[PDB]
Point group: C2
Chain length 117, copies 2
């Protein structure tokens, strides 16, 4: 049994709008990681407007056999306070095709920790 996921969105970088373009985005499966299998479900790069869509499938086995999808975003958008450009991990709800995950505007100049703490 294999389940597939599609995530879409539009990258925003208010601190440097050029940094929304040509951004490397990976859809990876933490369950596959636990199994030491290829965990890269899908890979895309954002376009000139910051748009992206990435679709991947996963088939897991053993104790953890439900796919656990994440987005890994490597980018050069300077964080608004610190000018950090740290990779951003998005926790993707476990919602599989025919369902599609539309993330909307994805901001690269602010991190989850900023607010959480």
């Amino acid at each position: 049994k294999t389940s597939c996921l599609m995530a879409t969105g539009v990258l925003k970088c208010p601190t440097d709008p050029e940094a929304v373009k040509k951004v490397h985005i990976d859809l990876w499966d933490a369950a596959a990681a636990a199994a030491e299998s290829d965990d890269l479900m899908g890979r895309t790069w954002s376009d000139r407007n910051g748009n992206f869509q990435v679709t991947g499938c996963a088939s897991d086995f053993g104790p953890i056999n439900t796919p656990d999808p994440y987005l890994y975003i490597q980018h050069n958008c300077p964080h608004r306070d610190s000018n950090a450009t740290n990779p951003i991990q998005i926790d993707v709800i476990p919602l599989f095709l025919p369902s599609i995950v539309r993330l909307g505007n994805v901001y690269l100049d602010r991190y989850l920790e900023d607010y959480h703490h």
Copy 2:
């Protein structure tokens, strides 16, 4: 300088129409391979209708600094004569965004060698 490519199409498998679904497709850069760098530009999986689109960027350096894109298709479509299910490599024209490569119907039950020879 980085150039990006998008390839789209619809997988067909006349010998087993189920085999168009959930097919792993990689967009890779032979120039990056020559440089021993990550050569995987993009990765997608076909949907329930066999549709796919994959977008990737590449930035090459050294003697071979023009990206040289290919599609690697791993699938279970039985070849019409032999029942082979060998991976299919598509030679992608060096045509980069804003240009998009629309491949149309991509048949998985017949190989380039069949005719060529």
